Design a protein around this ligand. Sequence first.
Ligand SMILES: Cn1c(=O)[nH]c2ncc(-c3cccc(C(N)=O)c3)cc21
Length: 194
Amino acid sequence: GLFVTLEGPEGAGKSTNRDYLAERLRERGIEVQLTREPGGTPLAERIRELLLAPSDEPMAADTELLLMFAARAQHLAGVIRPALARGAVVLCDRFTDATYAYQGGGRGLPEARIAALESFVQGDLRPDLTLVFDLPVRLDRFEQEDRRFFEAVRQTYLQRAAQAPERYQVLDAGLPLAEVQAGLDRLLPNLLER
Ligand SMILES: Cn1c(=O)[nH]c2ncc(-c3cccc(C(N)=O)c3)cc21
């Protein structure tokens, strides 16, 4: 199978582009499983609910990081690994790069602490390809965040893509839809090969 993750803020056309990619693969007779993080299983979605619900009690940054990984551990065992084992293409909306971006960049948690959790929870599993939807910068907890938080998120994704170029493709989400999809179209041949 192939593990593809999609990263980027809301409003960047990630969902419609994920559907587009799913259709181009399914039309070629490839099995595709769509999923998202945090979430993807009943327990993981209950965890997503705690992470998104605003509350008068502030959530510690360490709590936010640990809940993101707890949901990841469940989703990996329940959905992602089984899907990859069937030979499916998994198209996952957000994954550990979001942890580096939101919790590392956004919240200030050390990169090494995130890396240690990534290694614990995932073993050697990493996405085969990560599509970064780059976009210049009742509300849920992340929606409530300010411009600075989101600029840190944006730049973190870009830094990560630059560190491991072989695994990422940065798309300019500010461009028209048709333009972004043509980029996906051009990306398809390598995918069908990978
Ligand atoms: C998967 N993942 C992670 O590891 N750390 C994360 N932080 C935030 C989101 C997230 C989820 C829904 C919406 C938004 C948002 N509105 O920006 C962010 C997703 C994350």
